[PDB]
Design a protein around this ligand. Structure first.
Ligand SMILES: Nc1ncnc2c1ncn2[C@@H]1O[C@H](COP(=O)(O)OP(=O)(O)O)[C@@H](O)[C@H]1O
Lengths: 137, 396, 67, 62, 370
């Protein structure tokens, strides 16, 4: 029952590759590739493990409290101050994908939805085109 | 009014001094002849100069409390100290006192001379008061105490803090300065309590009350930001003063704090009471009773003292609220009965258009959802009829 | 059009003004942060020095008491 | 024509000022987070120093 | 509005001040700050730590004299604040820094930070009603009365030449080297060590300055005199000793005409004048050669002007009338020029008000720097 090994591996991995994972807020939108039938591509925002790292730091600090790497703490702080925006964006993307699944699983509907679908993609294009708009977000 | 001390001189010295004055000649040690050699005479002189040192120490070790007392007392205090020490040094530098020292030095009774030139804090006192004097010269705190106009009070705050900006060239104690600022806040709360007691706050109508309160919040606002400017400047000096001390507590409770809190709560009293009673200008006979609880607080609000205002006005405000609670229950139960007894839905709409602003108070607003939905299905059906009839076209 | 021009410049002014204000503000708060940090820095120094000299007093006590 | 072009440019300046403004706000808040970190450090440091201090003091004295 | 403008002539070695309109500067003292070196033991000692002015000069042995300004650039602002504050004390002016606009002399090509922080010092700690930073050459020509001509100064830490045309000081012809009086004294100290006499205390460097001020001269022929053994006149120290100088009295101020002795790629004074004149409009060269004004205390050596004439003749084109003036107030040239300039009605529009400084800031000073 030793945890210093885990604390060291945590500070290790976070300081081995999460040194750059921290402030990935600029490139808000990122296209993809998904090797499947047809090899489709989806849309993705860059905040997958970072949010859990924020929770990790808060847990170590309130829980035990170490001489937690201050650089990682401030980078977590910078992720926090931009995190809710990303949550809303990610859920919007997921709902968008779910709706596109329902829409294209039907065919008649496309005729009537065409306008709204173009509207959604109009704002999607305007959202993707820009990455990191500190003023208008 | 710091006392003054007239330092005595040996009369025989003054006799020979006046004899040197009857002719054109400067007094000197050589004029006493074989009188300097008298151990009795020199012993008398030593005793006299020792008494002088005692007297001067009585003034040089003087100091007051920078924490308590009015700020004006401190300004006048340092000025009076400069006057005292100035007259003291002119008494010291007189040729008679000089000749007494010359006699003791010729008599070699160095106890008196060294004690007269180093034990009195005079040389350091003059230095300290002259270092404090530029901040102390012409401090305009009387302007707060001059005009009752809230704008004049604000302008006085501005001139006072710009005059307090002068600390950069004075080396005055920062802790004493903070206590001086709190004394200023005591004067602030005093002047505001004076003015607002004359303005008849709870008496007057809501509009004049509002203007009064706006100017008062401007006073607090100017206090706040201008004081923060002084905080910044004090930290600027502190960064060059950190080499001396770090006893800068920086804890300031400017006296007007609970006055400010009290004003905002009384704001809410005039605001919210005024509102509810102003809505009952759309009317069962609890109107005057709401005004009674209102004036219960206008009477038992005891012309808003601070201490007892906390400790008693809490229950005063609360009491008024309890009367509004009964007023609510009666109005809500009343209106729900006039609503239930309303036989027409249009009549029911007339009661809703009879209490528009009363369907704001969440207390009232909670128990009507059922009636609301009845009206919504009415609205629903009629707009649906509009879809129908408009769906038929004008040509047909 | 010139009325719209001056309005846009008024908004520009508000941004410039409030920008200098905000820069100044955060510089004031940060100066206070420097003060708090510096105070705690000196306190840390004092605690370290007190630990050192008191451990040395304990070692001196070890020396003289063992003698 | 030139007036509307200047309106576009006036809005451009407004845009950039707002960009830099929001950026300064966020960055100064980040700097504030750094200051909070420094204070948290020194807080725990003072705690550890005081505790270790008193323990070694009193126990070697006893 | 205020009482009267106070012309405070700075200088890396000697500050000079007084009110405008005055004839001569009534208040002049060295620009150094002396704080005691020894230990206060006996009570009734010299109270107070930092000494400036005549008291610091009197009890020179106790102090550890340092300079806050070097090469016309302030190195320590605290000592400068105390010096300026001393200027406003009861020993020099007996006034307040709130009722007097301030004319401030300042050397060319200096960093912006000098004007900026100096302005902050005045308008904030002193809270003067109006500050006005200016050049020094412009003031010296105003002091002589004429209007177009170059100005060759060499104070204590700087030396430069400014070709002034009717007041417009041509900013593209101001050559400036940093070899002045104090540095000549420093090199003299090195030569005194090579003589055998050692002077290294900070309160002894001043004795080296005294020797420079009353025992050095300038050789006409720079080499012919070096190949001879002089009479080796003596010198009486304040201590009462005796120093025979020898060759260390003419080679010491030779530094100004050849900074190779100190090991530097700069130029002599003569080259500063000739380059300042030649980097100007060809239509004004004859007028500038016919009007050269000297100022600054380093232009007081024996045989200075004569050697300067010889050097300039070697560098100027043939048959061009060279004319070097040398008034009797080279130490007070910039101050007298300040007294003439600030005593005019146009000075009201020439300064910078306190209100303006609070509105714009330092940019207002750089805007209205002339
Ligand atoms: N008789 C003299 N001979 C040579 N040098 C002198 C003589 N008198 C003064 N100096 C030097 O000249 C300097 C005075 O110039 P100064 O007035 O300081 O110019 P500024 O005030 O512009 O710095 C002093 O440092 C001193 O070293």
């Amino acid at each position: 029952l030793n945890t210093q090994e885990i604390f060291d591996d945590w500070a290790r991995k976070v300081q081995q590759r999460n040194l750059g994972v921290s402030g990935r807020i600029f490139t808000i939108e990122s296209t993809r590739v998904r090797g499947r039938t047809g090899n489709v591509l989806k849309l993705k925002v860059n905040f997958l493990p970072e949010i859990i790292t924020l929770s990790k730091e808060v847990r170590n600090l309130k829980w035990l409290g170490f001489r937690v790497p201050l650089a990682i703490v401030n980078k977590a702080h910078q992720a926090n101050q931009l995190y809710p925006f990303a949550i809303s964006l990610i859920e919007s993307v997921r709902t968008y994908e779910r709706t596109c699944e329902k829409v294209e699983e039907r065919n008649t509907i496309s005729l009537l939805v065409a306008g709204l679908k173009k509207e959604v993609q109009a704002l999607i294009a305007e959202g993707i085109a820009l990455v990191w708009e500190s003023y208008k977000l | 009014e710091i006392p003054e001390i007239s330092l005595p001189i040996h009369p025989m010295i003054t006799n020979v001094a006046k004899q040197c004055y009857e002719r054109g000649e400067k007094p000197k040690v050589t004029d006493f002849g074989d009188k300097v050699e008298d151990p009795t005479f020199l012993n008398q002189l030593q005793s006299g100069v020792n008494r002088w040192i005692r007297e001067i120490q009585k003034v040089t070790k003087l100091d007051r409390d920078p924490a308590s007392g009015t700020a004006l007392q401190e300004i006048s205090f340092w000025l009076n100290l400069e006057r005292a020490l100035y007259r003291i040094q002119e008494k010291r530098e007189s040729p008679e006192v000089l000749l007494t020292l010359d006699i003791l030095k010729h008599g070699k009774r160095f106890h008196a001379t060294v004690s007269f030139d180093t034990d009195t804090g005079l040389k350091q006192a003059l230095e300290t008061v002259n270092d404090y004097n530029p901040l102390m010269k012409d401090f305009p705190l009387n302007d707060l105490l001059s005009a009752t106009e809230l704008d004049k009070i604000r302008q006085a705050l501005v001139a006072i803090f710009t005059h307090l900006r002068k600390i950069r060239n004075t080396k005055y104690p920062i802790q004493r300065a903070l206590r001086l600022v709190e004394a200023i806040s005591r004067d602030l709360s005093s002047q505001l309590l004076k003015v607002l007691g004359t303005r008849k706050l709870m008496h007057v109508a809501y509009e004049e009350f509002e203007k009064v309160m706006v100017a008062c919040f401007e006073v607090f606002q100017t206090w706040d930001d201008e004081y923060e400017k002084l905080q910044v400047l004090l930290r600027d000096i502190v960064k060059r003063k950190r080499e001396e001390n770090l006893k800068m507590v920086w804890r300031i409770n400017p006296a007007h704090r609970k006055l400010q809190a009290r004003l905002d709560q009384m704001r809410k009293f005039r605001r919210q009471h005024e509102q509810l009673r102003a809505v009952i200008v759309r009317v069962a006979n609890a109107i005057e009773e709401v005004n009674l609880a209102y004036e219960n607080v206008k009477e038992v609000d005891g012309l808003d003292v601070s201490k007892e205002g906390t400790e008693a006005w809490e229950a005063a405000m609360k009491r008024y609220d309890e009367r509004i609670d009964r007023v609510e229950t009666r109005i809500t139960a009343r209106l729900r009965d006039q609503l239930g007894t309303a036989k027409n839905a249009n009549e029911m709409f007339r009661i809703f258009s009879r209490f528009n602003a009363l369907f704001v108070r969440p207390h009232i607003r909670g128990a009507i959802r059922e009636y609301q939905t009845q009206l919504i299905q009415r609205v629903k059906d009629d707009i649906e009829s509009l879809h129908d009839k408009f769906k038929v076209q004008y040509p047909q | 059009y010139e009325q719209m021009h001056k309005e846009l410049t008024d908004k520009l002014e508000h941004l410039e003004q409030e920008k200098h204000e905000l820069r100044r503000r955060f510089e004031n708060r940060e100066g206070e942060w420097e003060g708090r940090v510096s105070e705690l820095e000196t306190d840390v120094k004092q605690l370290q020095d007190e630990l050192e000299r008191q451990q040395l007093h304990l070692r001196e006590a070890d020396r003289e008491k063992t003698r | 024509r030139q007036y509307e072009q200047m309106h576009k440019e006036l809005t451009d300046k407004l845009e950039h000022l707002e960009q830099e403004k929001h950026e300064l706000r966020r960055r100064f808040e980040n700097r504030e987070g750094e200051w909070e970190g420094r204070v948290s450090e020194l807080e725990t440091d003072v705690k550890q120093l005081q505790d270790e201090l008193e323990r070694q003091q009193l126990h070697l004295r006893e | 509005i205020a009482n009267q403008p106070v012309v405070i002539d700075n200088g890396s070695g000697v500050i000079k001040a007084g009110f405008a309109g005055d004839q001569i500067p009534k208040y002049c003292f060295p620009n150094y700050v002396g704080r005691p070196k020894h230990v206060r033991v006996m009570a009734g000692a010299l109270e107070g730590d930092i000494f400036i002015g005549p008291k610091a000069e009197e009890h020179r042995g106790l102090l550890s004299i340092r300079y806050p300004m070097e090469h016309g650039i302030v190195k320590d602002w605290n000592d400068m604040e105390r010096i300026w504050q001393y200027v406003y004390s009861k020993d020099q002016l007996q006034t307040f820094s709130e009722e007097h606009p301030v004319l401030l002399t300042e050397a060319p090509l200096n960093p912006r930070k000098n004007r900026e922080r100096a302005a902050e010092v005045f308008f904030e700690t002193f809270n003067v009603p109006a500050l006005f930073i200016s050049m020094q050459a412009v003031l010296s020509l105003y002091a002589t009365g004429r209007t177009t001509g170059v100005v060759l100064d060499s104070g204590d830490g700087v030396t430069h030449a400014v070709p002034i045309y009717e007041g417009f000081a041509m900013p593209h012809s101001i050559m400036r080297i940093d070899i002045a009086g104090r540095d000549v004294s420093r090199f003299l100290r090195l030569y005194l060590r090579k003589e055998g006499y050692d002077f290294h205390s900070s309160s002894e460097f001043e004795i080296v300055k005294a020797i420079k001020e009353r025992a050095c001269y300038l050789s006409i022929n720079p080499q012919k005199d070096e190949t001879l053994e002089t009479e080796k006149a003596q010198y009486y120290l304040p201590d009462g000793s005796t120093i025979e100088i020898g060759p260390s009295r003419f080679r010491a101020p030779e530094l100004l005409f050849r900074p190779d002795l100190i090991g530097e790629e700069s130029e002599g004074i003569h080259e500063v004048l000739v380059f300042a004149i030649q980097k100007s409009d060809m239509d004004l060269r004859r007028t500038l050669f016919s009007n050269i004004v000297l100022s600054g205390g380093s232009t007081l050596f024996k045989g200075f002007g004569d050697r300067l004439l010889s050097e300039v003749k070697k560098l100027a084109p043939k048959d061009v009338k060279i004319r070097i003036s040398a008034p009797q107030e080279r130490l007070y040239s910039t101050w007298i020029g300040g007294s003439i300039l600030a005593s005019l009605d146009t000075f009201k529009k020439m300064w910078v008000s306190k209100k303006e400084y609070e509105e714009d800031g330092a940019r207002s000073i750089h805007r209205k720097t002339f």
